Amino acid sequence: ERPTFYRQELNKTIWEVPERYQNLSPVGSGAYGSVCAAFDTKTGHRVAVKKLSRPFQSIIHAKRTYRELRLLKHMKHENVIGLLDVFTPARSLEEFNDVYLVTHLMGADLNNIQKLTDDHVQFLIYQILRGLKYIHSADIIHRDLKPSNLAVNEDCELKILDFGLATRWYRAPEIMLNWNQTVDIWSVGCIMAELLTGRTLFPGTDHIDQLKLILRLVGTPGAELLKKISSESARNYIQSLAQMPKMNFANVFIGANPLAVDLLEKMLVLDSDKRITAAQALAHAYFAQYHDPDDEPVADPYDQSFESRDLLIDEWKSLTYDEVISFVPPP
Template identity: 25%
Template sequence: MFGNAVLRRFGLWANDCRRSSSSEFPAPRDKKGAVPAAAKWNAATPYEILATLGEGTFGKVVKVRDRERGVTIALKIIKNVAKYREAAKLEINVLETLAKRDPDGKHLCVRMLDWFDYHGHICISFEMLGLSVFDFLKDNQYHPYPMEQVRLISYQLIFSVKFLHDNQLTHTDLKPENILFLDSSADVEYNMKKKRLNFEINETTTDRLWIGDLRSRTSFHYRVHAALQGTRELGWSQPCDVWSIACIMFELYLGFTLFQTHHNREHLAMMERILGPIPYRMAKRTKTKYFHHGKLEWDDRSSGARYVRENCKPLRKYQLSDDEDTNLLFDLISQMLVYEPSQRLSLDQALKHPFFDKIPAESR
């Protein structure tokens, strides 16, 4: 089994954190808050940068060797920019709070090992984890995960994000890139061909979910369209995480993205093609340029319309078989992709869906 799907960046273990003073290390000479170059960093700190794991607008995540402890860890280095510093401080507070509420780590949250302020650069260290769910998929030429892995990863992802929801938190950036396996060593059979990849396939492997913008691939595909987030009732709340998880489950099963577009109007057209018309009441209340009198403004003769017709179809038509597992999976996905947030399945309800009945008690 691929193990348990879980949280990274809202993961913890802040109990053992050090809070080093920036005065311990010489000041970097960076510009506009940029992260210091590896050579300067290696010379000025006890951490040796070995590789870049990901970059984003906030800064970067690097693989480092802690020369004092002799261990390899992941270090998130935030740009010395006020808004990113404040966001990092909030992240640390969340990590510490969740660590206190889950001291045994049963909710599969990532371990924050340490944090410190390096001359304005907030740095947070985490345990080193393996490939992401997306990278594993990509390395297998986008062959979808086996059904049992779809089931287990989905269950553990829902279980972990539910822990956030139970603590009045909303993720808002769930995507396959943010779900990481605990380590890397696997022997997986795809289409009767064995492919050696770095993943341990067993019942005890725990995955982690990383919350953060680490790659160029946008999370646009996994979000409820912004036009449907226009009011307080429709805004960024816990049901938006439910939608994102459903999109991830679809991708695990089929190997490709449900809403493959970067264009707002086209995104809405895809939603209507796959899920049916957006309810009149919601469309009327969006107050955006995409709707007129409660109906999506969309030219059926355009090249975009042709693309949507040729590449999208009603949700149930994506099923590769009509067996019980597939029917249950798509029943669950459809209930998590209901337009009305108040009618969308909650994560507590999702965990009780019959699709997960085959997961043994020891894997829950």
């Protein structure tokens, strides 16, 4: 029982969407790609419709499209973006070439929310950790967490997403030198610090400067962590730099809530085996007033075996088409 579509141009781009979506207006200045705001006549709420660009232009684009659809269909959590609809005007695989995604209309990102109160930071970071506990439990690593990938509405309700299109300021040092899930926790540490102080914690100009700033705070690796670098070039570099002491975070986040400081000490550790996880962090005393261990769920298992597959462009397209058809809309 297929719906009725209607076509229209919008800023040198064609849009064929269910009549159920109306009053489409472009949002961003193309920053988010081809995205419009909309009114959903089924529900009566604003939505965001994104039309992918050249989704099957190449083998790599076909796989990235399939990956994005598969991940979005899996996410069912209050602090993670979710898929409200996915559709295509095509009536059969032979004419399938465009893919539309429908999500909630997000309010503003965390860059667009002056420092916050300590209570505001607790709530926002709490919600990020809660969604991270959920994606991490599915063996899903975000990898690109940063204020522009956090959406927050007027109730300060937060959702994690990934718009795609600097990342380096938030990036774990191990995956910037190539020597697990807690790369995301490092980024939370950087975000949390910024909310507290009002300043980018590690505003590095490139990768070597980014590492220089990081070690000035957390200190040069010790032999405990040195014993775990396999990359021989990485070891030589770190041992050649000037030995800089670990700073005491209380002298750097002066005046901040000492629970917040203690949590920063547990997130912004160089050794990834010692970094706090999302689930452990939810139990930190700093979130004492939001922590609810009975309402911090994990995710269903996520089959990502496809990621190790080499398929042709038309096969990835077919699989994307499967996921479009099999899609069941939520409540």
